DNA sequence: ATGCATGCATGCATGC
DNA sequence: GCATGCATGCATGCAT
């Protein structure tokens with residue numbers, strides 16, 4: 001059906017905002033979203049759900065779509081119990097020091113599950129941790145790590161989120177030493193087990209080595225490979241062409257540019273990633289709107305495209321990750 | 332058009348000040364400035380803008396120009412959006428320790444986001460961060476780094492600056508171990524992604540070690556090469572001739588000396604970085620004004636030029652930078668062939 | 675006036 | 691041995 005035609009009478013800002021809000025439900029995304037939703041609907045005794053994808057494949061967008069859907073689902077049940085929390089999600093902070101700071105992570109976890117109805121669980125065993133003089137929670141600096149962890153466990157078991165999201169969980173990987181890496185993921189696992197809360201990890205292929213330090217991790221968790229569209233298969237090429245056609249039909253410009261015929265050039269840079277493709281089209285459309293142009297030329301794509309040096313490194317990284325996603329059976 | 336002739340009646344300080352304030356809009360600076368402007372106007376999820384080039388090329392001047400232009404643009408809307416700070420800029424501190432110190436960086440970042448009017452941002456952090464009844468937002472020493480970072484992010488998301496400027500970005504390369512370099516920029520990437528604030532990083536080619544730290548970071552970054560003029564192409568030589576003619580016209584003196592004739596020497600001891608040429612000309616003009624001479628001689632230019640060893644070292648660094656920064660259609664075809672059929 | 679909350683002063687393990 | 695950060699120790703202030 002394309003974009004609404006009346007947007008052409010609107011200023012450039014409105015049209016640009018429209019494009020950003022508009023979403024493409026591509027089939028790989030639908031598959032991954034459905035799988036993740038179904039796995040959320042039934043833990044099956046697995047403490048972790050790992051969603052690893054090539055950068056730009058839609059990971060964070062997927063995570064967001066999941067929170068919206070679960071909030072829509074949980075609002076009717078939230079009617080009854082105000083205290084219960086639907087979903088908690090936060091990005092893992094990359095540490096500036098040698099290793100991951102779990103203390104700051106616990107503080108930000110407590111901040112994330114902050115509830116306006118604080119009167120339900122105003123005391124987690126706190127040394128002045130609860131909010132005061134401001135809406136935001138004021139965690140006491142001198143509180144030791146185990147006490148903060150206990151308070152976080154109490155808050156989790158009180159609110160009981162359906163699933164706990166860690167955005168860009170590749171950061172957990174940073175650690176001071178090769179042998180000390182074994183402890184982080186297992187500590188997170190212990191926290192998940194005691195709380196009983198389903199934890200989900202989203203990140204790049206960097207966590208793949210962090211993923212399978214032993215077979216126990218594979219046994220106790222579920223893998224969701226957010227695969228990109230691969231030019232090797234004509235199926236993925238056709239899907240990519242369909243996505244390009246949808247973007248051509250939905251970008252707010254007077255004349256729809258023929259993006260489809262330049263699919264090879266788009267793949268060259270995007271590498272089958274829809275998010276990178278969407279970002280590139282947003283760049284080009286913003287350029288055109290600021291020029292008040294009428295159509296998109298290949299020069300427009302070239303001007304805001306990623307440098308071929310960037311694409312080379314990106315392709316090497318994703319190809320290495322995909323090859324790593326080939327562990328064989330012990331049979 | 333030349334300098335205002337009335338300046339000749341003014342003292343030497345005014346004559347020098349006019350030339351110091353004088354600016355040249357040479358084409359490559361305009362191209363880079365336009366690209367940076369357009370990228371800032373649309374972050375498009377990109378987390379980093381890497382602007383790098385040789386020493387003396389115009390990068391800091393660009394940082395000041397974009398700051399002023401964005402402030403001017405946002406002022407009419409700043410008349411309604413009081414809490415906003417359009418552009419904030421800070422210079423990375425070269426650390427005395429073997430590794431960069433993030434604590435001082437965060438403290439100076441908060442200091443950079445300062446408004447004598449406390450009303451716009453009444454609360455900045457947990458404790459030990461509020462101002463001491465003065466405009467300066469002094470930070471208590473015992474405040475640990477993670478809480479400091481949290482306060483910085485809470486201040487940033489409230490002020491919501493369009494772009495965060497980190498000048499002289501090469502100091503981020505100071506680290507104790509090799510692959511810890513990934514983690515050094517990963518921290519800033521996490522800050523940018525959490526705060527939703529686009530970071531522009533400016534520095535020399537020493538920062539090229541950051542260029543492909545990771546595929547994620549490669550996607551998140553945009554490269555803007557501040558090209559210095561290369562004598563191998565007659566186009567750059569023509570542009571350099573135009574710049575030299577403009578400087579010859581605009582320097583205040585009794586007569587305009589023929590700087591154009593000595594373009595070979597100027598390129599020899601400037602490597603085509605117009606900032607160094609401007610600075611050298613300012614030095615020579617200052618010498619002339621101190622002598623109150625009517626004209627610039629080649630001897631004056633020689634008296635305060637750069638040493639041949641310095642020029643050789645600069646060229647040796649620039650050659651490595653450009654070699655790292657080169658791309659050919661053969662590389663594109665090689666990439667395409669790996670992907671599938673290549674055209 | 676007596677226990678408790680907090681802020682500053684040692685202190686130590688780390689880090690080198 | 692200096693430099694660094696967290697932790698606690700001591701001490702004072704508070705307030706009921």
Ligand SMILES: Nc1ncnc2c1ncn2[C@@H]1O[C@H](COP(=O)(O)OP(=O)(O)NP(=O)(O)O)[C@@H](O)[C@H]1O
Nearest residue numbers: 020022023024055056057058059060061274275278
């Ligand atoms: N299928 C999609 N439909 C609509 N918007 C999308 C889609 N995929 C990506 N986007 C847009 O792209 C951005 C999020 O892309 P995202 O999935 O986070 O890429 P990403 O690689 O996961 N981010 P990161 O991994 O940290 O570099 C948002 O602006 C989304 O609107």
Ligand SMILES: Nc1ncnc2c1ncn2[C@@H]1O[C@H](COP(=O)(O)OP(=O)(O)NP(=O)(O)O)[C@@H](O)[C@H]1O
Nearest residue numbers: 354355360385386387388389390391392605606609
């Ligand atoms: N385009 C320009 N127009 C006018 N003056 C310029 C220009 N570029 C540089 N300059 C002059 O060069 C000096 C600043 O150059 P600058 O951009 O700071 O070089 P720089 O390499 O960034 N300094 P640094 O990086 O610390 O070595 C000032 O004296 C400016 O007047």
Ligand SMILES: [Mg+2]
Nearest residue numbers: 056059060061
């Ligand atoms: Mg993402």
Ligand SMILES: [Mg+2]
Nearest residue numbers: 387390391392
């Ligand atoms: Mg400079």
